[PDB]
Every structure is written in C-alpha cells, then in structure tokens.
Amino acid sequence: FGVKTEQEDVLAKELEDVNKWGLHVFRIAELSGNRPLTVIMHTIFQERDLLKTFKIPVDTLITYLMTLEDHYHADVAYHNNIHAADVVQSTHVLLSTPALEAVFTDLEILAAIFASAIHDVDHPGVSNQFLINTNSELALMYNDSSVLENHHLAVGFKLLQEENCDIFQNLTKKQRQSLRKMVIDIVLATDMSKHMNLLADLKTMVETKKVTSSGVLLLDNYSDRIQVLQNMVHCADLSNPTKPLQLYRQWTDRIMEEFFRQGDRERERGMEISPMCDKHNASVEKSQVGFIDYIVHPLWETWADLVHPDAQDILDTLEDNREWYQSTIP
Ligand SMILES: COc1ccc(CCOc2cc(C3=NN(C4CCCCCC4)C(=O)C3(C)C)ccc2OC)cc1
Ligand SMILES: [Mg+2]
Ligand SMILES: [Zn+2]
C-alpha cells in the first residue's frame, strides 16, 4: 500500500479530537497497539509544527517516543503510558486556552509538552513514602526528596542518549539549557508535597493579574511564566475529575487498583497501610469527594479565575462529577 491500514484509519479519526477536553484516550490506547503516548505526541508535534521549528528528524522523534513509552510499566494500573498520554493531551488543550494566546514561546510550549510526556516515566506504582520506608535504592539515590519526580526527569533525559533518540540534537546550547531548566522546574512541581505552595503562588498571581490590550495574560519575568507552566501541567496531572464521567471512572478504577496493590504490599510486609490503600477499609466515593473538595476544586477554581472565562465548562463538569460521587456515598 501507501495508505493507512483500516485500524490506522479509525485511530486517525479518533485523533481528530486531540484539541478537545475528553479525548477517548483509552480507545486510542487500544487502536494504537498500546502506543497512546507515541501517536498523541506525534500528532501534537505535527499540529504545533514543532518538528520544523526545532529541526527534529521525524525518525528520531518516533524512536525516542517509542523508547519513552516502553519505559512506562504496562503492569502499573494508573501511572502508565496512558496517563502520560492523557497529561500530554490535557496540557496541549490548556496551552490553547484563549487567555494564553501568543503568551508562550515555541521553546516554553516544547518544555510543557516534553515535561508532560516524561513526568511519570518508569513509575513503579508505589508512593515516595513507600520507597523511603523500604530503604529502596531510588530513595537512597535522591536522599528521600521528590524521589519519583527526580527519577522521572533522570530517565526522561537519559533516554535521549539511546540510538537515534536525541530529539534536541539541532537546538543551540542556549535553547537546550533553557528547555532543560524549564522541564526540571515543571516535573519537580508534580510532587504533591509542593501542591499547597504552587496553589498559594497561583492565587497570588490571580489577585495581581495583569492583562494586555488584547485581553491576554501578562507574564513578564521567568518566575511568573514558569509558575503558570508548573500549575498548567499540575492541573493536567489532576484533570481526571474534570473529564466526562465515563473517563473519570476508568481513572478512579485504575488509581484504586494501584493504591490497593501498594496496600497489599504494605500488609504483606507488616508496614502501616497508607491512606486509601486498604481494600478492606476503603470508601472510594467519600475519598473522591474529599480529593475534589480539598485538592482538585481549589486548584481548578484558581486556574478558572486566571483564564476567566475559558475554563467554565471544565469547572462545571468537575462540580457535576463531585455531586455524582456524593450521591453514591452509602
Ligand atoms: C485530601 O484527601 C484526599 C482524598 C483522596 C485522594 C486521592 C484519590 O483519587 C485520586 C488521587 C490521585 C493522586 N493522589 N495523589 C496523592 C494526593 C495527596 C495526598 C497524598 C495521597 C496521594 C497523587 O499523587 C495523585 C495525583 C497520583 C490521582 C487520581 C485520583 O483519582 C482519579 C487524595 C487526597
Ligand atoms: Mg507523578
Ligand atoms: Zn502524573
């Protein structure tokens, strides 16, 4: 042939939703042969013309994306390549928000998307606290500090050194140093221990919000530009409850499978069982309402204020999903 197979035709039709909140990312995983991260990253890179802008050879991009996707664990229910693909596509939609039109450079866009793609790579499906309490090698390497997030970054960068994997081979030293610092700042901000400070700084920025004549956000210094990118990827990472309920419930099934598996490993070893990890002493519905009330709603309400009114339908879906879970509390 020279034209797509029939499976490739159906995948290409699903990928027409790539600019929309609520992409059927599970269907894209099935149709791509478990390559959601590769096909979604490729589609986004083509759509945003990043291959031409950064002179990325297409074979090098595909080789790196497949290598990165392979270092996500297929046996981990939540922190896998589908979650990476989801956070990439969600970051992509947030970057296109009208309140941010023409705010970010091509290099900052590349940073936010690359950061999203690598942000959980080689996740073992247990928490930082589990790795610290078991005296894992990873906890020792990173001195018990943002252990997983340090590891995600180190693997994401290290994989650029595999055969035909250096997608940044044509960037100048100045571009690579700036890209690298922004990617590190974004992924380290995905550690939930940083959530409260990130949210305080986003709130401060909403109170002192400056807008251009075009009605778009004004971000002068690096500190403000990087805080917005950090909160954007953090929002993408915490975007599950803002999705149509059929998607949210698949994410909830997956995180609860992963948490219960950690709880089984803790109970086996006689360790204290972590919050929400005890399959015998769990209230999935109550936990989701608490997650939304204390973490997700305060973050997304502050984001919605920053980009008012672009996020109103996302905030509405979140409040609808919150009432659905509340209404199922036994
Ligand atoms: C305030 O009461 C809460 C009540 C419930 C929860 C989590 C239950 O749901 C989900 C949780 C997560 C995550 N939970 N956390 C951490 C949250 C912060 C405190 C430590 C526990 C783990 C993560 O690092 C990620 C982002 C992977 C993702 C997707 C979920 O549903 C689709 C959290 C808090
Ligand atoms: Mg993470
Ligand atoms: Zn994540």
Atom index in ligand 1 nearest the CA of residue 252 equals: 32
Helices (H), the chain: 6-14, 25-31, 36-47, 50-54, 58-70, 81-95, 106-118, 128-133, 137-141, 147-158, 173-188, 195-207, 222-237, 245-268, 284-291, 297-306, 312-326
User: Structure resolution in Å?
Assistant: 2.2
Annotated catalytic residue within 79, 152, 234, 297: 79
Experimental method, per PDB record: X-ray
Query: Is the CB of residue 325 below 6 angstroms from any atom belonging to ligand 1?
Result: no
Q: Decide if 79 is catalytic.
A: yes
Whether residue 255 has its Cβ less than 6 Å from ligand 1: yes
Label residue 303 left, alpha or beta by phi (over 0 means left) and psi (-120 to 50 means alpha): alpha
CA of 14 to the centre of ligand 3 (A): 23
Mutual angle of helices 58-70 and 106-118, in 10-degree steps? 30
Kindly state if the Cβ of 274 falls inside 6 Å of ligand 1.
Answer: no
Q: Where are the domains of the chain?
A: 1-330
Distances (CA, A) of 55 to 43, 104, 166: 16, 19, 11
Cα(291) to ligand 1 centroid in Å equals 6
